[PDB]
Amino acid sequence: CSWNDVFQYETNKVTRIQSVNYGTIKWILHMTVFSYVSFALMSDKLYQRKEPLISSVHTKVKGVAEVTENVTEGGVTKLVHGIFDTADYTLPLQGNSFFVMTNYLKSEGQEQKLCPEYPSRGKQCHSDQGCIKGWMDPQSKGIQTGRCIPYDQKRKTCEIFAWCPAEEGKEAPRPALLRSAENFTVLIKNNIDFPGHNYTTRNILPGMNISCTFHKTWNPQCPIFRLGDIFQEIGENFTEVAVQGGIMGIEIYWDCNLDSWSHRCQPKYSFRRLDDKYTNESLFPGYNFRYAKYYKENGMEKRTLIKAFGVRFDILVFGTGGKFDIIQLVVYIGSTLSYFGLATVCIDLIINTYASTCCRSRVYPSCKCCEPCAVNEYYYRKKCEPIVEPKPTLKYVSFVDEPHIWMVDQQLLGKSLQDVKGQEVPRPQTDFLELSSPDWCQCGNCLPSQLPENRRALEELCCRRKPGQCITTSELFSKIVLSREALQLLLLYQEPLLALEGEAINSKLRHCAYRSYATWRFVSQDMADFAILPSCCRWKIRKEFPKTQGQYSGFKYPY
Amino acid sequence: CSWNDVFQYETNKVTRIQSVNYGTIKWILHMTVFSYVSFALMSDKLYQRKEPLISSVHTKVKGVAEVTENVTEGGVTKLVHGIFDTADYTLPLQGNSFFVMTNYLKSEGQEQKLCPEYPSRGKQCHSDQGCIKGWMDPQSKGIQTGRCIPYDQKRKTCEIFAWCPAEEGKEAPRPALLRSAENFTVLIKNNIDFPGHNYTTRNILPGMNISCTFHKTWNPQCPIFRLGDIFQEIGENFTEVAVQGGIMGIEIYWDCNLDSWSHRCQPKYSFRRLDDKYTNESLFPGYNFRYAKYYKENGMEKRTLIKAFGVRFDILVFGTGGKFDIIQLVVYIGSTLSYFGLATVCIDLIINTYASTCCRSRVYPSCKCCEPCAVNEYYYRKKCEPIVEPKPTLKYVSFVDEPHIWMVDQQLLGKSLQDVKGQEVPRPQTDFLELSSPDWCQCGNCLPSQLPENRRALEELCCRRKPGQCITTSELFSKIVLSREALQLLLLYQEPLLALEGEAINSKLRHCAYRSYATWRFVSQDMADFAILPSCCRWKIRKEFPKTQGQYSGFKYPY
Amino acid sequence: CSWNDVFQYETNKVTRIQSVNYGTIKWILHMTVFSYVSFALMSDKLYQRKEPLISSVHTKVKGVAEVTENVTEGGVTKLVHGIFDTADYTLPLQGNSFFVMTNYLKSEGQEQKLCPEYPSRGKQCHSDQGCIKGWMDPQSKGIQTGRCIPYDQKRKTCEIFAWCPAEEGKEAPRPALLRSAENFTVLIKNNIDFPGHNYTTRNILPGMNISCTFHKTWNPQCPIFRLGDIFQEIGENFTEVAVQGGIMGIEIYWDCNLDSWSHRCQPKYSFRRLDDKYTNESLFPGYNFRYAKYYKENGMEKRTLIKAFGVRFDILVFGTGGKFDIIQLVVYIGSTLSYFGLATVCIDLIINTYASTCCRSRVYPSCKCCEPCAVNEYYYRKKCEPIVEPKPTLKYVSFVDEPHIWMVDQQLLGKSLQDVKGQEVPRPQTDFLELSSPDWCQCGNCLPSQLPENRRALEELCCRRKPGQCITTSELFSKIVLSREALQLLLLYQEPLLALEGEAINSKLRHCAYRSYATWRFVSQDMADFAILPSCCRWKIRKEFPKTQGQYSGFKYPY
Ligand SMILES: Nc1nc2c(ncn2[C@@H]2O[C@H](COP(=O)(O)OP(=O)(O)O)[C@@H](O)[C@H]2O)c(=O)[nH]1
Numbered sequence A, B, C: 001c002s003w004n005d006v007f008q009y010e011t012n013k014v015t016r017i018q019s020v021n022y023g024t025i026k027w028i029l030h031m032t033v034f035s036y037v038s039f040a041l042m043s044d045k046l047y048q049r050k051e052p053l054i055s056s057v058h059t060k061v062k063g064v065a066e067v068t069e070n071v072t073e074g075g076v077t078k079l080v081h082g083i084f085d086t087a088d089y090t091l092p093l094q095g096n097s098f099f100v101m102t103n104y105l106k107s108e109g110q111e112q113k114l115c116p117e118y119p120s121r122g123k124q125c126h127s128d129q130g131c132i133k134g135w136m137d138p139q140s141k142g143i144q145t146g147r148c149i150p151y152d153q154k155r156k157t158c159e160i161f162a163w164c165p166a167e168e169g170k171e172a173p174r175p176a177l178l179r180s181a182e183n184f185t186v187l188i189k190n191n192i193d194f195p196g197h198n199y200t201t202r203n204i205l206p207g208m209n210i211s212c213t214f215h216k217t218w219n220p221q222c223p224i225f226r227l228g229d230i231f232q233e234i235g236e237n238f239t240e241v242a243v244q245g246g247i248m249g250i251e252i253y254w255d256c257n258l259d260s261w262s263h264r265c266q267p268k269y270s271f272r273r274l275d276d277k278y279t280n281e282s283l284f285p286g287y288n289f290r291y292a293k294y295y296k297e298n299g300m301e302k303r304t305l306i307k308a309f310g311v312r313f314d315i316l317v318f319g320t321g322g323k324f325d326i327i328q329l330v331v332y333i334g335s336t337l338s339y340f341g342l343a344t345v346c347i348d349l350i351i352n353t354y355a356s357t358c359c360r361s362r363v364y365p366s367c368k369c370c371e372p373c374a375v376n377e378y379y380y381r382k383k384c385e386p387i388v389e390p391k392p393t394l395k396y397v398s399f400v401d402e403p404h405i406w407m408v409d410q411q412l413l414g415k416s417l418q419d420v421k422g423q424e425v426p427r428p429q430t431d432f433l434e435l436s437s438p439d440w441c442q443c444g445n446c447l448p449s450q451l452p453e454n455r456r457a458l459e460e461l462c463c464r465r466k467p468g469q470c471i472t473t474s475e476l477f478s479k480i481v482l483s484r485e486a487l488q489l490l491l492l493y494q495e496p497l498l499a500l501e502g503e504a505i506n507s508k509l510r511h512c513a514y515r516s517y518a519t520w521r522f523v524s525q526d527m528a529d530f531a532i533l534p535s536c537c538r539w540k541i542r543k544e545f546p547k548t549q550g551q552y553s554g555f556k557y558p559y
């Protein structure tokens, strides 16, 4: 608002404790924070801006296998010897995955025509009622025709229009026909980019030996892998997995630092099985798929249908490239700055916990080692300044016999303030730098109030809680309170040019006396504004400074 | 630096307000923060380290369809009945996407030779000038030859060397030939890994029924999906999309908790359309691609070119696997600790806002409900201690007639300090614990200065701003200021063994008197160092304690 | 614990400095923080919830090429003219990558039979010992048979069962046969989804011109790209890369804002080379793969094996879609709130640094510009209150001749407290508001102690460190310390109703005197509890208030 309020700055008040304990603890905690953050910075390279890589994988599988087996075509079974090369056991998959056929079931000479279903999964029909024309299910190799026909002697099945002879349902051959595929080799060419860092690298370095095969120990940087070795590394068996197939994962990790002084961008090759470790009791065990090779002889389309089992090798290339970036370093430092409140939190918790009072009587006798730590009480005394809410029902009373002040914050509701009991607030220590018979009356000098019957509950108070000498007869009472010269001097200190013979001057003196007593018994001003004078002292003060104007008022809210 | 400065610890000074309001508000806000953080922890499982999954998808589509249609080859059109099985309507795509052919346009008997362009997109030529030899465009089915030839009667087009007869440009057949593909079923085998958690699972559980088809309600865990059902789930129509094709997405979500007490790793299957919901008015509507089946009869290469329309089903497998990690829990707790400053911020804002002064005169009459909250002023009085910048131009003046002190921080530049007006700083309350005629002159006792003409602007001051009794004649002035015994006692309190008859002792006494007045009128010491004594009081003090040494000096900078 | 302790609230004590410097610096720093956070919010759109996109890419390549070359089949070499269209130079890859064949080496008429290895990589054998039956290596086109055979005159090689005639090992033809592929065009249909934002868009907009080809400047939104143009954009040469192949990346970026007032969702097309920029000296340079086309003539399976070189174009679609979210805005604001401690940190650092004392004597003479800034000392005086650890070995001593107090916190171990020297703590300023011959003896009035020989080291102290007048003879000593009336008044102020003739009253008076001296010389109470009185003053006090009970005790721990 105002211009003065604009250029103002708040800084917290603090207290510096000269304690070897706190200095030690604070520096230990600060050094622990600093050491941890430096270790994290120089281990996780949090000063480096890290960028993900753009990968490109190109794969080539080399190796040939020979398969000698009996094959049936045109109703004739013959022993055929065949050769499988890259073009024969690989699919033209161009990317991060390649497939090697380890086993196959091929049906040759297929022609679109009518034929019986092969009876492999309960496809047995005894009458045309068991076949629905145009019907199909997932196990159907064709579209059912309404009429049954005999597949062979002593066995009958539904007729279907399909590629015939229909695919016989037979399990994967054991041993795998292309188990020799464990000896095949795959070259993986992996090119990675960090655009932000403007860096490119490949998994193939100049001077590489072509007649190399990866080995984690002897040759961990040759990107030519034997498939059987890939399987042994984990513990898998290629010949067993070859029968029904599987999925293998080739992980190429690039933890690259592009800093010149610390430069290292090399691929780490790891192998995982991404298929279920299936057994003889497993649902959908393996990896198979059907493709067809189409041809035609004698002017009619035909196909060889191959159900291929094999291992699909998915290739997961991942990693990060780090290069020094001052923004990252500065941001990390800024984040870590907050960590250094550890010392303040810990030491302040100790100070507040060891200044709970309960610790002194109970904990110390049980444990004498933690005895002197009660010094924290001193530290809490200087650190904290308790302040009460100033409210109309707040009162303070003091009894000479009593040791301290009573905070009667509870509304009286007609009960005498003498009777009412409240919190026992300690009396503050004086500024020694300067020093250097009503039913509720125990003193006898208390006069009955003059307030309204409801209001007089507050003024019903005695200088002491038990019978004895009145505070009013104390010699110091006249010196401090009733001393006209002292009150006049105080007023002059306040208002040096006030009329000495004013009509209302007496009233002012009375107020001063109220303050004086409230300050003599309730040291703190905050505790002296809300104090309540006993009836005896109040009425002697009134006698010394009476008011002909009318009935004397009473305690009024300070604020 | 020094060893003492090493073991020092700063702890903020604080004030504890005994207020039911603040205790209540503080605990409400703390409980709200705590409840929110606990809810977030136990809902988002922020105590769990979450790891992304490595997925592997293997898909198998089963189902057959029959297509009866007129096909033209070698110039002969014949009604051909054909059967499409998995090997016929699927591409050998091995991964997260599979394609089902829903429609096709096949050109048979193609041979590399010369033939006319089919006139489908304005490929009309009337002379050889309209054809450019060797020319090609994206709509060209061949390489233009320079000479026109007649495609048929009453129509002519450019000659091309291409696969002939050239692909006729005709729109996707309606209805789709393989709309029966809505009845096909796809099995998705999904294997996921969490390496950090060392966990593997598959979307297929033991005891699964093979004769099952996914249903969100009856059977949400069968990984066999009917394609038509996939489309209905969203609202799409397979037969309509079958004509030109599309792209569908199968999302497999894995929200997995690997904690033993709370273990749940199941796939959630959802379906999305990744193609545009195209209509009769849409650019590039659908999904089609051309492949060829190559063969040869009579020792010459030929091909059947198939333009295939269908639905590509991309499969998006994503998810997270969570397992309890104490580091995550501790880090989250550490993050949440900062949230608990809500109470301090709110309550301190209330205290500072309700102690703005402007609130009292203006806001309270309008709203009497927010009347007692002025207690915050008290809380601001104890919390904050305003301190001014000590600067050479800083002065304070007090006038008996005036109620408080004036902070004249503006340089005089020759203007009398009496004339100059400045900020009205309130007079601090005394430590009652101890208590318990120049043109600018209104008093008449002010003597003209003796400073340089420029310097005397500061000393041009009167005890009061209006005519009246001088402060100097006040009885308390002699008691406090001019009282030789009092000043000697103060000096002894300072230096108990100072010479009582020293030559310069008078000067010391004078200084003491300056302090005494500055303390009698400007209570706070910080406000009494920079105070300026009126001419009358200063010159009476000089008269009581004169200096034969020479001309008296004046106010000098405290620091 | 107690109900009173529940409703308590701590608020830090603060001091508001009225400094134009701090107000200015604080507001400058606050405005810098606020401006930075607003700039970041409105640039990075940190008020927007950002969601990653789900992409779908469908690609179509159009263009034809003619290749005239000599081809060998069945032992006959003939000049063959061929045509390559989309079905001929593309693989049926359905996804984010497409392949265009730019070169090829095809071996025709292959039949499974026995044939010699082609001698291309040192496959020279002179006797059957150089061939191992059943042997295979990665360069083997077949399975070795034990017997050598002559490939041709004057050259011999191992026999193999393989597809024969065996693949001749010859390098990629130059120039590329399908270099015309630089003129081919690719249409990329890219459909993106933001599920959270429920937004879908495609890279193709209504009103697009089909006869368009992408251009960064003229036509940056046509998704039809000429491949040669893709290469020129970077700087690559299609005809050179066509020979052996490569990999290109097409990046489609979607920076989309879905806010209605600011709506922009358009694709940004960029091109990168994902292959190594290989040369004549590079390992595994290019991109090639082998596939086969299978057929049969005369009832025997045969194949044409094509080694295809080309460019695989991977398509990387990435981006984020932002929509206004109040949670994001509020969270970002909450994060930024902490940034506004910049002013407090900076100004408090200035205050603490410029109040180091060392700055005054050393820095100021060297630089007079930074002279008045010593005002920070004042600010440190009000801000910080040093407090020492109260410990049994803590003592304070004062010598009239000395200027301040000495903090002797070191255990004496028998050495006289007079001899022991310690820290020079300054004497605090008095509350002027109220003001307004042993060997170690230099005064002569010190009496030898009466403590145990070990304990008397503490009491061995003199009022002054050098010979001179004793403090005890000072007139103020009797007024303050020995004045019986003053001590009685103090005690009455403490206990107004204490017996005036009690047996132990003298002892109380003695204690009061100890306090009085400790307060006269050690102003601060904390520094006066641990003070040590000189022997002379202590023994005069004892003489005035002797104790017949027995030997006088000495300083005891305050707490
Ligand atoms: N602390 C305290 N103050 C009192 C007491 N009685 C009166 N006062 C103060 O005295 C001031 C005036 O009261 P008083 O002079 O007795 O009323 P009057 O006779 O009608 O003028 C009020 O502002 C009260 O705060 C008391 O018992 N304790």
Ligand SMILES: Nc1nc2c(ncn2[C@@H]2O[C@H](COP(=O)(O)OP(=O)(O)O)[C@@H](O)[C@H]2O)c(=O)[nH]1
Binding pocket: B507, B510, B511, B514, B518, B528, B529, B530, B531, B532, B533, B534, B538, B547, B551, B552, B553, B554, B555, B556, B557, B558
């Ligand atoms: N606060 C205040 N201090 C003063 C004033 N005049 C003099 N002093 C102080 O008195 C001290 C000495 O001034 P003074 O004795 O009058 O000069 P001298 O006569 O030449 O020795 C200086 O350090 C001033 O701070 C005044 O009007 N106000």
Ligand SMILES: Nc1nc2c(ncn2[C@@H]2O[C@H](COP(=O)(O)OP(=O)(O)O)[C@@H](O)[C@H]2O)c(=O)[nH]1
Binding pocket: C507, C510, C511, C514, C518, C528, C529, C530, C531, C532, C533, C534, C538, C547, C551, C552, C553, C554, C555, C556, C557, C558
């Ligand atoms: N600060 C201070 N206090 C003292 C010294 N000597 C005694 N006291 C205090 O006086 C109190 C009682 O000591 P004292 O009366 O001399 O012992 P007594 O004669 O046996 O009763 C103790 O609590 C001490 O703290 C002193 O040299 N310096």
Ligand SMILES: [Zn+2]
Binding pocket: A440, A441, A442, A443, A444, A445, A446, A461, A462, A463, A464, A536
């Ligand atoms: Zn009484």
Ligand SMILES: [Zn+2]
Binding pocket: A443, A444, A445, A446, A462, A463, A464, A470, A471, A472, A534, A536, A537
């Ligand atoms: Zn009484």
Ligand SMILES: [Zn+2]
Binding pocket: B440, B441, B442, B443, B444, B445, B446, B461, B462, B463, B464, B536
């Ligand atoms: Zn005057």
Ligand SMILES: [Zn+2]
Binding pocket: B443, B444, B445, B446, B462, B463, B464, B470, B471, B472, B534, B536, B537
């Ligand atoms: Zn005057």
Ligand SMILES: [Zn+2]
Binding pocket: C440, C441, C442, C443, C444, C445, C446, C461, C462, C463, C464, C536
């Ligand atoms: Zn002595």
Ligand SMILES: [Zn+2]
Binding pocket: C443, C444, C445, C446, C462, C463, C464, C470, C471, C472, C534, C536, C537
């Ligand atoms: Zn002495």
